[PDB]
Amino acid sequence: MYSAHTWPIAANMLGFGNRAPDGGHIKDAPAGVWAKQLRQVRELGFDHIDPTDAWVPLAALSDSRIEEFRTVLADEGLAISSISMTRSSIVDVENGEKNLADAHRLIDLAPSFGATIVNTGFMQALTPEQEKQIWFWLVQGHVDDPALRDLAIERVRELGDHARTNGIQLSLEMYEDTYIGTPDDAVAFIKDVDHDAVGLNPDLGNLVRLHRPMPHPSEMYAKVLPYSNFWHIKNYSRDFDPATGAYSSAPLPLKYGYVNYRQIIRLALELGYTGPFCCEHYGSDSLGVCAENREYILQVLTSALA
Amino acid sequence: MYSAHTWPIAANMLGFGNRAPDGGHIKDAPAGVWAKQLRQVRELGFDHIDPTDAWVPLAALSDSRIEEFRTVLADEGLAISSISMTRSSIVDVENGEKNLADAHRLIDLAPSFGATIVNTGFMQALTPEQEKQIWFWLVQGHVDDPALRDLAIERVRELGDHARTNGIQLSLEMYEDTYIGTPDDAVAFIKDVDHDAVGLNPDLGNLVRLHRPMPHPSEMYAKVLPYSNFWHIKNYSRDFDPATGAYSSAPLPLKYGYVNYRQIIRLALELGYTGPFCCEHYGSDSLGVCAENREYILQVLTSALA
Amino acid sequence: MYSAHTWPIAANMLGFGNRAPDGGHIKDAPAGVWAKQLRQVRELGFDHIDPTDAWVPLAALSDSRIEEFRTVLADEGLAISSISMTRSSIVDVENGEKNLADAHRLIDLAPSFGATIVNTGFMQALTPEQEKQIWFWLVQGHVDDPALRDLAIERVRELGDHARTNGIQLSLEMYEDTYIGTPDDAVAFIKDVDHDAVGLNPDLGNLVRLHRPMPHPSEMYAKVLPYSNFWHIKNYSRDFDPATGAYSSAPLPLKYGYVNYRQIIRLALELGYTGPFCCEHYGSDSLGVCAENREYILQVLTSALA
Ligand SMILES: [Mg+2]
Ligand SMILES: [Mg+2]
Ligand SMILES: [Mg+2]
């Protein structure tokens, strides 16, 4: 596997969004604008990023703009270890075929950067009601259509074939209200896919934040880590008040939230986990917390691998 | 403007209160007692303080005691960048005229320390019911009297004239249940004041903590930052449980709470903000969290100004 | 007293539990297994540990296994400053006499390690319903039997006699729903015990986390610190929503929770507190947060003792 100091721990770029400081789309911005965003990430200690598809859209750039991007990525001291598609489901009713095609494009781009994972999930656009809430997860939004599960499996396998040929893997991001929205459902889904270049991304912070019953993360992670090839890793406080029935959660650094990631990262290692990490953190100071989380993971790994 | 390393980031002294370790009033204490309190602040890395009016009452000291204070302030490696009056409203029914007179005294004292802001707000004493709560903001206390708004504007302008003559500015601290207790109300108030030596202090942590509907801080800060000349800067987690209607909040470091202060400080800069900062943090380890917050702001500024 | 840099600040070992990585009991593990657990603690900066009775059971080991343990403790750069029995009440109906005997054994072992405290409390096993909750403290579990208070006092005194003879002291851990589950009850209990080698352990985080009315920690600590000889020191956010009646709490570093431990540690010192500290933190990254808490305490002490 990697050693602690070379294990990729990527900054997820979704917090930058896709608007340029001048008001247009980031896809059209001069490379120097991209460079200043990347610089903020390097300043906080990262070696790796995950550009997502919610920042500079690599699948959409011309080949010459890809090379402009490649130059500033290197100049700013960074590399891409994974590419995570966000709210771009391959079974979106309107855009699923486009999203599938973009996923294939990202599988071809990934090896050129040295990236080893393309990640997809079944989350879709936030609904208007979700956008009004203090956090989007406070109300249910998109719920996967049961009639499209077989299509989802077919398209996952198609992507996995391409990934395998390119020497990389596809990862499937666990997310609420989707085909892979509970530990048992995720396990059954990855077993049904039956593809040696596809694995889970156990982004269980997505579940721990929810105001609904949830098994303890120790139990959930033990189920899904054996099938995991990539890891969006974030934490939340979690609380409940039996007398009222109120739940609460707050995004927090890995060290401070409800999951014990010292125990869980060590468990992952024990279970043979070898995939890259990706620090995500919706809300709060997303980038600043991700940077603390990277340092945290590096200490945990250093101790566990010594 | 300032550079990142010279931008004043003051420790607010209100957490020391006004009781001396021996049991009397801090106003009567030997200068060495003041020195040991100041030393705790310097030990945590600050260059600047804001004494408030809730610690050593500078407006009340004799001139010779002011010089005693000035000596220990320098000896302990600190300087005053702003002076923030607390629960000392210039339209308090009993003490408003005294508070106005004290504000004028502070405007005369400020330049001697190199301070560039005197800050006033419309908060008043906590009520007995507020004092019984886990946090004072859990119940409504003082609510400004509509019949005194014109008097408030008149007295603000009077202070602003004095500030202008002294080469400094007055700032108006946003605080719930006052004339400047919502973004729109604060904007309308500063426009009505119509004075080029008066500005807002967008202490929006005061609002984010409240168990009531509140616009997202991105939206609120965008409205008020164009009018801001000083900044009490603090954060809170913020959560809500739709099924019960319960709200919750907890004081936290800037990096960890609901506001994204990386984005918001950069926005402020983009909007031409140049005033000093003041780290405030009611509850918890107020001084310790303020010290982390200062280091946080310095990193954000360093990156944004590089 | 101690100086800041020699004041013992122990890592509580209960978060390791008593299962060995291979699946058996830690009591049977090779010393090298113990060494790797101890190493994680030293890596995070500790000089001292409190083994508890929930990790390697020192009272149960043979004398030759004690010496095996002693060797790896030294090899890994650590020492024992206190031994805290957990859910091992000396008035447990089934196991009280065994627990009493084990407490005596620990009083004989403690001086050999240089430890100055053996700590006992009246908490008992978590109930099945407690084990199902998001946190055990969300539902009431064991409640002490009033008819056994006199027996408890008798057995405390018996332990205190032994402690005194051995040049150490017994501490009594405050914990909800026990004889010492409120400040007033703890004070009355320690006064009734009337023993100069017994004192309180004011683990008031145990109370601050609870979803019930609670006096402010300033008030509670002022009552119990005069009687305290040892200190399990942890923090929680604490919040309440009057409109719904919902409470919430989350384990957090000392610096970030509801108690102001800068003020409270300084108060302790003022009140003559001289006992060792023990960093405990149930849930979250227990060890990682304890390590930050140790650094925190060392800064507070350094400033207060300078
Ligand atoms: Mg994710
Ligand atoms: Mg303020
Ligand atoms: Mg304890």
Short mmCIF file of C-alpha atoms in Angstrom, two decimals, chain B residues 11-266:
data_model
loop_
_atom_site.label_atom_id
_atom_site.label_comp_id
_atom_site.label_asym_id
_atom_site.label_seq_id
_atom_site.Cartn_x
_atom_site.Cartn_y
_atom_site.Cartn_z
CA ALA B 11 -8.80 40.49 22.15
CA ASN B 12 -12.07 41.71 23.69
CA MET B 13 -11.51 42.03 27.48
CA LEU B 14 -15.15 41.67 28.61
CA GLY B 15 -14.54 38.06 29.71
CA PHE B 16 -12.37 39.31 32.57
CA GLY B 17 -15.30 41.26 33.97
CA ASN B 18 -14.84 44.07 36.46
CA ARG B 19 -14.21 42.28 39.74
CA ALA B 20 -10.68 42.13 41.08
CA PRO B 21 -9.26 38.87 42.31
CA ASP B 22 -9.38 40.27 45.93
CA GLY B 23 -13.15 40.99 45.72
CA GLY B 24 -13.34 44.69 44.98
CA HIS B 25 -13.79 46.53 41.70
CA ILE B 26 -11.07 46.22 39.03
CA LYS B 27 -11.15 50.04 38.72
CA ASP B 28 -9.49 50.26 42.15
CA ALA B 29 -6.90 47.48 41.68
CA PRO B 30 -3.15 47.98 41.65
CA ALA B 31 -1.73 48.26 38.15
CA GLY B 32 0.06 44.92 38.70
CA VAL B 33 -3.30 43.17 38.87
CA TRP B 34 -4.25 44.63 35.47
CA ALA B 35 -0.83 43.56 34.22
CA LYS B 36 -1.39 39.89 35.07
CA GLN B 37 -4.73 39.88 33.18
CA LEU B 38 -3.13 41.59 30.17
CA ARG B 39 -0.24 39.07 30.35
CA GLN B 40 -2.63 36.16 29.81
CA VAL B 41 -3.76 37.82 26.56
CA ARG B 42 -0.19 38.47 25.32
CA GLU B 43 0.80 34.88 26.22
CA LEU B 44 -1.81 33.68 23.71
CA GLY B 45 -0.31 35.74 20.90
CA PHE B 46 -2.32 38.97 20.74
CA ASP B 47 -0.78 42.33 19.86
CA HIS B 48 -4.01 44.27 20.40
CA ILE B 49 -6.89 44.43 22.88
CA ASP B 50 -10.27 46.11 23.11
CA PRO B 51 -10.73 46.93 26.81
CA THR B 52 -14.52 47.36 26.43
CA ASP B 53 -16.22 49.27 29.26
CA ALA B 54 -16.89 46.02 31.23
CA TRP B 55 -13.30 45.61 32.51
CA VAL B 56 -11.11 48.59 33.64
CA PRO B 57 -13.41 51.60 33.05
CA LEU B 58 -11.12 53.99 31.22
CA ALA B 59 -13.76 56.74 31.07
CA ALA B 60 -13.95 56.70 34.89
CA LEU B 61 -10.24 56.67 35.77
CA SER B 62 -8.35 59.69 36.86
CA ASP B 63 -5.77 60.95 34.39
CA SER B 64 -2.97 59.67 36.65
CA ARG B 65 -4.59 56.19 36.78
CA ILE B 66 -4.89 56.31 32.95
CA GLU B 67 -1.11 56.75 32.84
CA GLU B 68 -0.63 53.85 35.28
CA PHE B 69 -2.74 51.76 32.90
CA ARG B 70 -0.89 52.99 29.82
CA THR B 71 2.43 51.89 31.38
CA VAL B 72 1.29 48.31 32.13
CA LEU B 73 -0.38 47.99 28.73
CA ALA B 74 2.97 48.78 27.07
CA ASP B 75 4.97 46.70 29.55
CA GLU B 76 2.82 43.66 28.74
CA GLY B 77 3.36 44.09 24.99
CA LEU B 78 -0.13 45.21 23.97
CA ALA B 79 -1.95 48.14 22.39
CA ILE B 80 -5.61 49.21 22.12
CA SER B 81 -7.08 49.22 18.58
CA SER B 82 -10.77 49.75 19.46
CA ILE B 83 -12.93 50.48 22.52
CA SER B 84 -16.32 48.71 22.64
CA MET B 85 -18.99 49.87 25.03
CA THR B 86 -21.20 46.98 26.01
CA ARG B 87 -24.69 47.21 27.72
CA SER B 88 -24.29 50.98 27.99
CA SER B 89 -26.87 52.31 25.55
CA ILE B 90 -26.90 56.03 24.77
CA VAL B 91 -30.72 55.81 25.00
CA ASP B 92 -30.87 53.82 28.25
CA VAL B 93 -33.76 55.41 30.13
CA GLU B 94 -31.86 55.81 33.39
CA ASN B 95 -28.26 56.08 32.20
CA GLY B 96 -28.39 57.24 28.58
CA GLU B 97 -27.02 60.71 29.21
CA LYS B 98 -24.17 59.24 31.37
CA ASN B 99 -23.44 56.69 28.65
CA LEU B 100 -23.36 59.43 26.01
CA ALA B 101 -20.92 61.42 28.13
CA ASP B 102 -18.73 58.32 28.64
CA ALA B 103 -18.77 57.64 24.89
CA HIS B 104 -17.44 61.18 24.30
CA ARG B 105 -14.72 60.59 26.91
CA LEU B 106 -13.72 57.36 25.13
CA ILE B 107 -13.56 59.23 21.79
CA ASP B 108 -11.06 61.60 23.40
CA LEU B 109 -9.06 58.76 24.94
CA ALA B 110 -8.94 56.56 21.84
CA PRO B 111 -6.38 58.48 19.76
CA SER B 112 -3.94 58.56 22.67
CA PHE B 113 -3.74 54.75 22.44
CA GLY B 114 -3.70 54.68 18.63
CA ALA B 115 -7.22 53.23 18.56
CA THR B 116 -9.32 53.96 15.46
CA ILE B 117 -12.82 52.90 16.60
CA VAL B 118 -15.18 53.55 19.45
CA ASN B 119 -18.09 51.08 19.25
CA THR B 120 -21.56 51.50 20.74
CA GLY B 121 -24.70 49.41 20.56
CA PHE B 122 -28.25 49.35 21.83
CA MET B 123 -28.12 46.20 23.95
CA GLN B 124 -28.97 46.88 27.61
CA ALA B 125 -28.71 44.98 30.91
CA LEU B 126 -29.66 41.33 30.90
CA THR B 127 -33.01 40.80 32.55
CA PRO B 128 -33.35 38.54 35.61
CA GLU B 129 -35.04 35.93 33.43
CA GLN B 130 -32.16 36.07 30.94
CA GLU B 131 -29.68 35.59 33.77
CA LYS B 132 -31.41 32.32 34.80
CA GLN B 133 -31.08 30.73 31.34
CA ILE B 134 -28.34 28.43 30.03
CA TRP B 135 -27.58 31.29 27.62
CA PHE B 136 -28.98 34.83 27.91
CA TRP B 137 -30.16 34.77 24.29
CA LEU B 138 -32.59 31.91 24.96
CA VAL B 139 -35.24 34.41 26.12
CA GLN B 140 -35.95 37.92 24.89
CA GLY B 141 -34.74 40.70 27.15
CA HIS B 142 -34.57 44.43 26.39
CA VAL B 143 -36.35 45.48 23.18
CA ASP B 144 -35.70 49.01 21.91
CA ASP B 145 -38.43 51.58 22.32
CA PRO B 146 -39.64 52.89 18.93
CA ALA B 147 -40.25 56.32 20.42
CA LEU B 148 -36.49 56.73 21.08
CA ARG B 149 -35.19 55.95 17.60
CA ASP B 150 -34.93 59.61 16.61
CA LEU B 151 -33.04 60.37 19.85
CA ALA B 152 -30.71 57.46 19.11
CA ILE B 153 -29.96 58.83 15.63
CA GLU B 154 -29.34 62.33 17.07
CA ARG B 155 -26.93 60.99 19.69
CA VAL B 156 -25.12 58.76 17.16
CA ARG B 157 -24.57 61.78 14.95
CA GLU B 158 -23.28 63.81 17.87
CA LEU B 159 -20.75 61.06 18.62
CA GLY B 160 -19.85 60.78 14.97
CA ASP B 161 -19.04 64.52 14.78
CA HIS B 162 -16.63 64.10 17.72
CA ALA B 163 -15.10 60.95 16.25
CA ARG B 164 -14.52 62.68 12.92
CA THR B 165 -12.77 65.62 14.59
CA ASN B 166 -10.51 63.14 16.40
CA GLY B 167 -9.56 61.31 13.22
CA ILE B 168 -11.43 58.12 14.18
CA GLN B 169 -14.86 56.58 13.60
CA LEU B 170 -17.88 55.40 15.58
CA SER B 171 -19.21 51.90 14.96
CA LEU B 172 -22.72 50.60 15.69
CA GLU B 173 -22.91 47.02 16.94
CA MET B 174 -25.68 44.91 15.46
CA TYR B 175 -27.53 43.09 18.25
CA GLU B 176 -30.94 41.40 18.46
CA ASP B 177 -34.10 43.23 19.44
CA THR B 178 -32.55 46.66 18.82
CA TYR B 179 -32.81 49.37 16.18
CA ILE B 180 -30.05 47.51 14.31
CA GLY B 181 -31.22 43.95 15.04
CA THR B 182 -31.74 42.75 11.47
CA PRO B 183 -29.68 43.37 8.33
CA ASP B 184 -32.36 45.51 6.71
CA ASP B 185 -32.93 47.51 9.88
CA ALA B 186 -29.18 48.12 10.26
CA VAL B 187 -28.86 49.31 6.70
CA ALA B 188 -31.83 51.65 7.03
CA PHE B 189 -30.43 52.97 10.33
CA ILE B 190 -26.95 53.71 8.98
CA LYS B 191 -28.52 55.40 5.94
CA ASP B 192 -30.74 57.52 8.19
CA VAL B 193 -27.75 58.50 10.36
CA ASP B 194 -26.05 59.76 7.12
CA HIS B 195 -22.66 60.40 8.73
CA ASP B 196 -19.29 59.69 7.13
CA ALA B 197 -17.62 58.89 10.48
CA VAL B 198 -20.23 56.31 11.54
CA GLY B 199 -20.44 52.72 10.26
CA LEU B 200 -21.82 49.32 11.19
CA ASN B 201 -20.20 46.57 13.24
CA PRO B 202 -21.76 43.43 11.69
CA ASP B 203 -21.54 41.17 14.79
CA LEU B 204 -23.77 38.64 13.07
CA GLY B 205 -22.83 35.86 15.47
CA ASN B 206 -25.28 37.68 17.75
CA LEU B 207 -28.04 36.70 15.28
CA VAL B 208 -26.82 33.27 14.10
CA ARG B 209 -27.02 31.91 17.69
CA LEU B 210 -30.72 32.76 18.05
CA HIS B 211 -33.50 30.16 18.16
CA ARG B 212 -35.55 31.99 15.54
CA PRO B 213 -35.68 32.11 11.71
CA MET B 214 -32.62 33.83 10.30
CA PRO B 215 -31.37 34.33 6.70
CA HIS B 216 -28.17 32.52 5.78
CA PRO B 217 -25.10 34.47 6.94
CA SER B 218 -23.85 34.77 3.36
CA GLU B 219 -26.89 36.84 2.52
CA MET B 220 -26.84 38.87 5.74
CA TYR B 221 -23.14 39.74 5.53
CA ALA B 222 -23.43 40.76 1.88
CA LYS B 223 -26.02 43.33 2.86
CA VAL B 224 -24.18 44.92 5.77
CA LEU B 225 -20.45 44.64 4.89
CA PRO B 226 -20.58 47.63 2.44
CA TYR B 227 -21.48 49.84 5.44
CA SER B 228 -19.08 48.27 7.98
CA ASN B 229 -16.10 49.99 9.62
CA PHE B 230 -15.35 47.54 12.50
CA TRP B 231 -16.06 43.87 13.15
CA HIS B 232 -16.81 41.86 16.29
CA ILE B 233 -16.24 38.44 14.74
CA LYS B 234 -17.49 35.21 16.34
CA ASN B 235 -19.20 31.98 15.33
CA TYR B 236 -21.72 29.39 16.52
CA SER B 237 -22.92 26.03 15.29
CA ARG B 238 -26.54 26.43 14.16
CA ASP B 239 -29.05 23.62 13.76
CA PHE B 240 -32.80 23.06 13.47
CA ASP B 241 -35.00 19.98 13.64
CA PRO B 242 -38.08 20.38 11.40
CA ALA B 243 -40.01 17.50 12.97
CA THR B 244 -39.98 19.15 16.42
CA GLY B 245 -39.27 22.79 15.61
CA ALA B 246 -36.24 22.80 17.94
CA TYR B 247 -33.31 25.13 17.27
CA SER B 248 -29.85 24.79 18.74
CA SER B 249 -26.56 26.69 18.72
CA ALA B 250 -23.21 26.47 20.47
CA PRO B 251 -20.31 28.96 20.58
CA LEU B 252 -17.41 27.60 18.56
CA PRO B 253 -14.16 28.81 16.93
CA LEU B 254 -14.57 30.73 13.70
CA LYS B 255 -13.33 27.70 11.73
CA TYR B 256 -16.01 25.32 13.08
CA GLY B 257 -19.29 27.23 13.24
CA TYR B 258 -22.12 27.82 10.76
CA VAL B 259 -20.68 30.96 9.13
CA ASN B 260 -17.92 30.35 6.56
CA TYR B 261 -15.58 33.12 7.68
CA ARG B 262 -12.98 32.25 5.01
CA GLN B 263 -15.56 33.17 2.38
CA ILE B 264 -16.99 36.06 4.42
CA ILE B 265 -13.65 37.71 5.31
CA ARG B 266 -12.64 37.47 1.65
#
